[PDB]
Design a protein around this ligand. Sequence first.
Ligand code: CHL
Ligand code: CLA
Ligand code: CLA
Ligand code: CLA
Ligand SMILES: CC(/C=C/C=C(C)/C=C/[C@@]12O[C@]1(C)C[C@@H](O)CC2(C)C)=C\C=C\C=C(C)\C=C\C=C(C)\C=C\[C@@]12O[C@]1(C)C[C@@H](O)CC2(C)C
Ligand code: SF4
Lengths: 64, 163, 40, 211, 197, 80
Amino acid sequence: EIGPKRGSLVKVLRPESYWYNQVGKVVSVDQSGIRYPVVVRFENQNYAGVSTNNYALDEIEEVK
Amino acid sequence: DIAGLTPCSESKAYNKLERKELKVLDKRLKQYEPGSAPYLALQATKERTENRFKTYAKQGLLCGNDGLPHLISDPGLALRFNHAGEVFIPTFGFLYVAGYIGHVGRQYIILSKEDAKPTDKEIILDVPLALKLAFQGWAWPLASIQELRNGSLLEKDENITVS
Amino acid sequence: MKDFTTYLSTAPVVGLGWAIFTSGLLIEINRFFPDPLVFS
Amino acid sequence: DRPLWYPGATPPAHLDGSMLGDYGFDPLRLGTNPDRMKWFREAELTNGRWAMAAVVGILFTDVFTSIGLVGLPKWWEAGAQTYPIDNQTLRTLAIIEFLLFGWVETKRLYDLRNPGSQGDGSFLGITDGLKGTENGYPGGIFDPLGYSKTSPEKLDELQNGRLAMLAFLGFASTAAVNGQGPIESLQTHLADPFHVTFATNGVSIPHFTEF
Amino acid sequence: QRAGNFAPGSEPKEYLNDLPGNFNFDPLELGKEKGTLQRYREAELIHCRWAMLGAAGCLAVEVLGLGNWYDAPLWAVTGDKPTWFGIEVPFDIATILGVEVVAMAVAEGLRNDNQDMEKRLYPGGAFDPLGFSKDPKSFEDKKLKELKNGRLAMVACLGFAGQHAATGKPILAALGDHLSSPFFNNFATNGVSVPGV
Amino acid sequence: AHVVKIYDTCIGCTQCVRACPLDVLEMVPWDGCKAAQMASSPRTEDCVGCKRCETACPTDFLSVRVYLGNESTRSLGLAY
Ligand code: CHL
Ligand code: CLA
Ligand code: CLA
Ligand code: CLA
Ligand SMILES: CC(/C=C/C=C(C)/C=C/[C@@]12O[C@]1(C)C[C@@H](O)CC2(C)C)=C\C=C\C=C(C)\C=C\C=C(C)\C=C\[C@@]12O[C@]1(C)C[C@@H](O)CC2(C)C
Ligand code: SF4
């Protein structure tokens, strides 16, 4: 396994993101060398209406 | 007295304003008959007006040169010269009510968010829960300092920032 | 009836009952006890 | 747990545990956090213990007053009777009351924070006696009568103390709408019960129905 | 070396672990940093030592019947000459202000240029000719006496000021009112010390 | 004469390409994503600045940005 576990909650660390210092469920993780593999899903929508986004390994950290 | 203001009892313009406002009704009362309902309505307004003026004078209010009562805000002068009921005491009568509304809404928000689908609980309220909290908030200042001294009031850098 | 009570638990219906309470309370407190300004 | 203030079905959440005068009476749930429940417990005692020793000055004396043995004044006007006396002690009493209590109470405030925390050389030589067995129930203050194993005579201290706290609230309210003392108010309810009450004569409600 | 506790049972403060006059006092954490404490410990001893001399002064004028500490500079406005034990010293007001500044500036400046942290508080040599500081025990003990007595002078010189403003009476006269009628003659009965008496 | 830059976070949705009326954007293969696609902006001379491309990108923050700049006849949408 390369990254966090399925169904595990993680905290985001992108300064650009609407979900920054916020928590979301890990939907999936790809192990094929992609730059932004970690797929995360949040309950709260962003300004557009999207509730998912692919984040990186360094950009996510353990909850709270 | 203070600030060059006379009490409302001793003022002349204050009584002048009373004789004026009653003269308007007496002229208006001449048109109708004694036992009619318009007569009873105006006589009551006359009775209320006579009661409004004497009660404001009895309460140690301060009337200016214009003849209207003025209020004092500093608690020092209010307590020294016996004018506390004007501003200083109602300040605590409000804040008790205002914090009541915050302590109640804050608790309904926290408790509904501990369950599934909190969005539905806002548009479709849980009235049994809302009434429960609304009758449990009589002592909200106790819970606040309890929650402040404990540290479970504020969140700690788990909030979104922008840069 | 379960759905009727749920409709009554919506936001505007509950707000209507609140408004009649706060408004009727303030009015009747001004119907009796007319013209308060100083609190005793 | 002792019996319930409601006989029927008012389940308490955190009062099943041991405590004195536990009747399961906390609707507002102000005793959830145990740290501040520990603080409110001492408050009930200092209000309880103080209120009882206060109610005697109103009660034990006014009984002797109504009978006619002594000519002391009533509590609602005892303060204005002292300072006009020739040999009087004008109001350096508010501040000395605070300078004296401030020394004792902070010694009690620092005990709840650090129990049994009175250093060895801090006081002159009585540092040992000031240590207490528990919070609110110290040792060297009572001379006799605190060596039993069933220590809950404390329940008497609370049921008597909670009761007195109602008394002064009734004395203050009776003495603000009746205009008379507490015992004079009692002699009337006995002589004419239905006429002298909080409803009709004591203006606690706007009752004006003359028909 | 803890002399005591201002509040028995209070939590120890590690920043004051071993110093003269430690009572574990600081509740506002002033002195948490190590460098600022060396400055405060210097300021305390000098605010001390100036108060002790100034305190004995105010008593010396009144004990010997010379006058008040408050009325001492009043000769300037009237124009008469100052006095020391009624000797009629001749100097004028502009002469006092000139010699004081030049003299104390030479003194205070030489003090600041020491750069020996222990001697900035407790110098030696000329400032102690008799040699009490040679004994380390009595030196350590006498340091607590310098500091305990000094804190009395500071708090009490403030009392000479506060007592005077509310009541214009001098020092020993203001004391006599307490002894003659304590319960009646107090700061509470000034009418200015406490609002609402 | 507008500027269009696409960033590393593209995932090959093609929704930007479908939305642009003026055919500024096209898809190019790439090894960074699951879909093995990436956008491109070869012909920005025909860009107009509608920002429909930015509206369609579903990322947390946009993989496509239109930085407006100097104008022209094609950019101002002038039939005349
Ligand atoms: C330098 C500052 C200093 C300060 C700010 C305090 C502050 C405090 N100390 Mg100390 N202390 C200080 C120094 C020291 N304390 C102590 C030893 C103690 C002890 C042992 C205790 C305190 C306590 C207290 C509290 C007293 C509160 C009170 O009643 O005040 C109100 C003001 C006063 C009491 C002053 C009243 C004036 C007065 C003394 C006049 C005396 C003349 C007589 C009245 C004449 C007799 C007339 C008759 C007829 C009545 C308070 C937190 C008590 C406490 O709470 O501990 C936890 C306590 O038990 N302090 C020592 C020796 C080591 C000190 C040395 O510097
Ligand atoms: C708890 C003890 C207590 C007791 C024994 C009394 C007793 C009395 N009060 Mg009283 N009172 C009390 C508390 C108490 N009060 C409190 C806390 C308040 C403030 C809310 C008042 C406010 C008040 C007013 C405004 C008036 C009285 C009056 C009276 C007298 C006539 C009865 C009456 O009006 O109904 C009492 C009415 C109440 C609302 C209080 C009853 C509720 C209590 C808490 C129930 C306690 C249960 C039970 C009685 C306890 C037994 C104790 C006994 C064995 C010693 C009577 C001597 C009237 C008077 O003028 O006296 C001549 C009057 O006008 N009271
Ligand atoms: C009959 C016509 C009618 C009217 C006039 C309204 C009017 C309103 N609806 Mg609405 N609604 C209607 C029919 C109607 N609705 C129908 C048929 C349905 C389907 C069942 C809904 C379902 C519905 C939902 C699900 C919600 C509304 C909400 C609202 C309010 C918008 C939120 C706002 O601005 O307050 C913003 C308010 C605040 C920021 C703070 C709270 C303070 C408020 C103003 C106090 C309460 C106001 C009270 C309801 C006013 C009395 C009713 C008034 C029309 C006379 C607004 C008062 C929303 C709401 O929350 O209502 C309050 C809401 O969530 N409506
Ligand atoms: C300006 C005079 C002054 C200064 C600089 C100090 C400095 C010091 N004292 Mg000290 N002290 C003083 C006067 C002073 N004291 C007086 C008068 C007393 C007797 C009441 C004491 C009693 C005392 C004790 C009992 C202890 C100390 C201790 C200390 C040390 C640690 C605390 C600290 O860093 O405080 C830094 C403090 C300051 C820099 C002063 C700032 C003052 C601010 C601006 C407020 C001033 C206004 C204030 C709120 C009201 C004062 C007036 C009041 C009557 C209303 C430090 C060397 C402790 C220690 O370990 O010493 C070795 C200790 O245990 N002091
Ligand atoms: C400094 C002082 C008091 C200082 C106490 C302080 C700061 C308390 C601080 C704390 O409480 C806190 C804040 C917070 C805690 O974390 C720390 C501590 C430390 C516990 C009093 C006056 C101290 C007084 C001083 C330093 C100076 C005295 C000299 C005088 C009065 C001379 C006057 C004359 O020369 C003339 C002018 C006129 C002539 O007529 C007569 C003579 C006598 C000749
Ligand atoms: S719209 Fe954005 S995320 Fe989607 S394919 Fe185009 S560049 Fe990638």
